[PDB]
Design a protein around this ligand. Structure first.
Ligand SMILES: O=P(O)(O)OC[C@@H](O)[C@@H](O)c1c[nH]c2ccccc12
Ligand SMILES: O=P(O)(O)OC[C@@H](O)[C@@H](O)c1c[nH]c2ccccc12
Ligand SMILES: *Cc1c(COP(=O)(O)O)cnc(C)c1O
Ligand SMILES: *Cc1c(COP(=O)(O)O)cnc(C)c1O
Ligand code: NA
Ligand code: NA
Lengths: 250, 364, 364, 250
């Protein structure tokens, strides 16, 4: 449905940046997680990046790893995640929803079958953390066949040949890991700066650097990690953070 | 784009975050160069010989096979410095790190075998080692605190993988730095028997000692290659470590290979009386050799391995590692099940079992 | 009346009850025959090579000597099957027992090193072993329950003495069955340096590993022979194990040699951080070499030995036995006290220190 | 003073065998030991064999070894033994007294000096347990110089050449370990059978075999070992045993 294409179009007309928060599905629990996500959206999140708990997350930071443990402890499973995803899409028809996956969970019951399921629940993009552009062929081909945008990470130590690949293979948005001109030169999908984004000034700096927006995960998860015993205060603090970060993109 | 084929049939590859590709590409390039560099070979050979103790002996066991038509030889990697074959590949990887201008080593270990091996190599070659036997490692200057750390320090640090698994070019590098096991075994057997072995047998945890023995015989079609995975309490109990034959193909640890995972796709744990064979997956080359039928894989339970352990101690005066006991256990079965079958076998005794003196004691 | 001289100067002899003389005479005769028998040599050499792992490596330590004019080489007996030089002489004695038509081995051990060595040899050569590491011995079929038993069973059993001491011809036999240590060291050093060592250093508990290294160099007057006795807490404290230089000549264990005894003539005990050097006396040949000034003996305390132990681990990646650490400790002193002195040294690393992993741990 | 030569002469005129008991000096204590020895003599012992506690007794049986431990535990020392020996000789001028020694205790402060001390206290013979005939030269030469009889053990597995040596080097008596004609043929000192002698019939059998007597140790020591808590009963049982054994030699 080109939710990413539509979002960036509207954002550019309002000369604003995008603010995309990241959270682990089912953390700290299915019920509380769904409420967290609705608070993030109501607060002003332009898009969502959602992770599915995996047993061995290589490129997962410490704060993110604890989120997975809380999810697993709650009894969260990939099957339950897709149930949540369908529920989220049913309440929010236009917000772009991107998944942060690990290769085995996608390859498990068939690559093509996984992306078929994403398209069925309404997912817009999928970023396979442990699948480099050199091994992406089957994943991005299957993603495109099911109208799912294959997202690629552009590292800081990336050369020109990688920039071209990421620009050619990527769709939806380019995950810029904390160069924007070169990406636009190769007509890459709108860049979103991620990693380290936890303050309002960073979001403005990103938009001023030439990026279409910024992604924030650790900061978001940390608020959850420090209010487990107070669900209400959790949502309250999440709303404030998100509201401030989004205000910086305007 | 790589210099060497990252795959073995459908198994292998480099399934790691994009940020780690430069490190892998650099490693493959340095390896390709070192392999063609006579100076590197001479340095590597010098350490293996005057430091590690190679060549290792090839012992014939006449007491164990008495009464049968089986002739059994044991490749003595238990006599190598450190007490295991692991030393061979850590020395090579250590030299590669220096060749790349690196001064730090990053590693991790479960039981501590690989941790100790990396520490000893690092102390010798003057490298700063950080690891994730604890006393043995510290005694050798190794700092006991992985890929994450290597992500932002690979310019000055090398990740010393401990088995023939993980992303390319590790599977290929670990094999080449362990292949002298098979090369020596071939020269030794030809000298003692004037012919090639009917079959070589080695335990398969990660696949490094096994591939080291197999490598040089792969082109010798008449030679059987038998890999032995741990059966734990029994395959049917589910508590085992035999993913190659009883697992399911998946993507983990930077590679596509047989793995022990839940129906959902969550990597599970592999059990075995020997911690050294706890790797929940297996090297890609082994998966491939199995697929085409060049190599055969079987499993041995804890009880069978324990029995092989006791049998070698009393009949040959050698205390094998519980890991190596799985290989010996299968050889004994081959012999016992068909005592009148004429066959020349070689079991790779990957290590000594002094470390298993307590484990086997309690079980008794 | 004997075939070989039972004495080394005034030291040696056969001070045992009359009833044991036939056993000693028989042993000397069989030994003299075996030594001239090519078949015996070939069998012995075959075991040492294809079973024990000889030749052992000669490792140069460049990190430890950095900044000085000392070049240090370590004879790697720690790489021998069993982890110590002991294996060499037990294999030989085991073959002698079979040559005499015997089928039983009698032995005793303190820490268990020699007990294990005799058990492994007995299991290999099909001998019934009775000993007076306990699990390791039992695991190899050895029965853990001496001269008394041998008195009335020497017709079917051989007493496997564990050091270059006791009544003739044991001192002489243990030396000959350990001399390959020195023979290899000589060939290896000539190949690597093109000259003989300035001095060879080995710890002296009973004197077997030391005499094994010394033997082949005795006629090379330019080569220094240095034996290192344990100093324990310090010679002046009385709690040590240095009878050769700080003991008194007496008659015990079937021989006349330096001993640690009370003023009254009651044999005392020798202390050392390393149990392997607890022998309250020393081999007669060593006493003799000292008397004529051919060999020099010194002592190293527990603290110095411990320090040598830690130093080899961090600078060379080798974990030496606390016993061998006494030898290394003296070499380090020779180097440290005169850093600008050009000297080529060889330390006999009699064994690995994995067994001392706990002992050294507690001390720390 | 040729006490052995005199004893055998008298014994032969009475057509009787000799009965020589063995005990460890100082076992279980100096005071009790001296009393034991006087009871042995009063009971009919023809000669005495006395052992000096040594730290490492090779040819010492189990029963004998325990005796040494009891002696050492009592604080017995070689110096105290010689004090006892002088006391024993002062009370009994004709009874032959033989010592059972270990090489180090004799070699310790000089071989010649040790035998000089024996001659001073009145000792008649010395048997060095761990000194074979092949290593006896300095010991027997020193013994003869101080009028001490050097005693040698003739094993059962002894050949003809050993018989000649034992016959030529020995004096006082020959310790026959459990052949008598050959010894007499070579004019060896009167033979005394030892080892295993614990019953009256064995003493008669020995004398009938051609021996001049028998020595008993383990049996004697055992009586001490089983009456430590009853000094009186100890002497009583010792007297009975000795009396019976000696009666068998008549
Ligand atoms: O936590 P940070 O610094 O705010 O960055 C978001 C990041 O954690 C999230 O996008 C993410 C979760 N898992 C990943 C795996 C690979 C790359 C990125 C991710
Ligand atoms: O104990 P028995 O069997 O009765 O034998 C006396 C013997 O013990 C005594 O003469 C003896 C004591 N110590 C020895 C040493 C060597 C020879 C003999 C001995
Ligand atoms: C660690 C170990 C193994 C397991 O490794 P592979 O990579 O499967 O060889 C096998 N044997 C010994 C003795 C080991 O220490
Ligand atoms: C037992 C032992 C020794 C002591 O014996 P010697 O007879 O003095 O050689 C020395 N080193 C090691 C490693 C030992 O195990
Ligand atoms: Na495995
Ligand atoms: Na000593």
């Amino acid at each position: 449905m080109e939710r990413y294409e539509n979002l960036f179009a509207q954002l550019n007309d309002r000369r604003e940046g995008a603010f995309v928060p990241f959270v682990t599905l089912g953390d700290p629990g299915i019920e509380q997680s769904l409420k967290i996500i609705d608070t993030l959206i109501d607060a002003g999140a332009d898009a969502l990046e959602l992770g599915v708990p995996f047993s061995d997350p290589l490129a997962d930071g410490p704060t993110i790893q604890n989120a997975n443990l809380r999810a697993f402890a709650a009894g969260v499973t990939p099957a339950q995640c897709f149930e949540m995803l369908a529920l989220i899409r049913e309440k929010h028809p236009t917000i772009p929803i991107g998944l942060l996956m690990y290769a085995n969970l996608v390859f498990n019951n068939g690559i093509d079958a996984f992306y078929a399921r994403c398209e069925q629940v309404g997912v817009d993009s999928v970023l396979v953390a442990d699948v480099p552009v050199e091994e992406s062929a089957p994943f991005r081909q299957a993603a495109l066949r099911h109208n799912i945008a294959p997202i690629f990470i552009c590292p800081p130590n990336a050369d020109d040949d990688l920039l071209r690949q990421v620009a050619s293979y990527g769709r939806g948005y380019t995950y810029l890991l904390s160069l924007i001109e070169k990406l636009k030169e190769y007509h890459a999908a709108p860049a979103l700066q991620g990693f380290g984004i936890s303050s309002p000034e960073q979001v403005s700096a990103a938009v001023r650097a030439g990026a279409a927006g910024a992604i924030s995960g650790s900061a978001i998860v940390k608020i959850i990690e420090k209010n487990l015993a107070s669900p209400k205060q959790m949502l309250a603090e999440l709303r404030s953070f998100v509201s401030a970060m989004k205000a910086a993109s305007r | 784009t790589t210099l060497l084929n990252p795959y073995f049939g459908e198994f292998g590859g480099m399934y790691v975050p994009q940020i780690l590709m430069p490190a892998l590409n650099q490693l493959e390039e340095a390896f390709v160069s070192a392999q063609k560099d006579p100076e590197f070979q001479a340095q590597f050979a010098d350490l293996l010989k005057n430091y590690a103790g190679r060549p290792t002996a090839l012992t014939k066991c006449q007491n164990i096979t008495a009464g049968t038509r089986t002739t059994l030889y044991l490749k003595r990697e238990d006599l190598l410095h450190g007490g295991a074959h692991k030393t061979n590949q850590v020395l090579g990887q250590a030299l590669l790190a220096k060749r790349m201008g690196k001064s730090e080593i990053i590693a991790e270990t479960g039981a501590g075998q690989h941790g100790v091996a990396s520490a000893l190599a690092s102390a010798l070659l003057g490298l700063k080692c950080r690891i994730y036997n604890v006393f043995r490692m510290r005694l050798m200057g190794a700092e006991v605190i992985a890929l994450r750390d290597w992500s932002g320090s690979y310019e000055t640090a090398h990740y010393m993988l401990g088995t023939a698994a993980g992303p390319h070019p590790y599977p290929t590098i670990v094999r080449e730095f362990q292949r002298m096991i098979g090369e020596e075994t071939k020269a030794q057997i030809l000298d003692k028997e004037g012919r090639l072995p009917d079959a070589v047998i080695a335990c398969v945890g990660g696949g490094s000692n096994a591939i080291g023995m197999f490598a040089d015989f792969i082109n010798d079609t008449s030679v059987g290659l038998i890999g032995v995975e741990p059966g734990g309490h029994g395959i049917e109990t589910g508590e085992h470590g035999a993913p190659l034959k009883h697992g399911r193909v998946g993507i983990y640890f930077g590679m596509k290979a047989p793995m022990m995972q839940t129906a959902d796709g969550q990597i599970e744990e592999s059990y075995s009386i020997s911690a050294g064979l706890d790797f929940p997956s297996v090297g890609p080359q082994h998966a491939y050799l199995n697929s085409i039928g060049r190599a055969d894989y079987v499993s041995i339970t804890d009880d069978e391995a324990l029995e092989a352990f006791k049998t070698l101690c009393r009949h040959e005066g050698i205390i094998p590692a519980l890991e190596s006991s799985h290989a010996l256990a299968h050889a004994l079965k081959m012999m016992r099940e068909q005592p009148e079958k004429e066959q020349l076998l070689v079991v790779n005794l990957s290590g000594r079992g002094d470390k298993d003196i307590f484990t086997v004691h309690d079980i008794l």
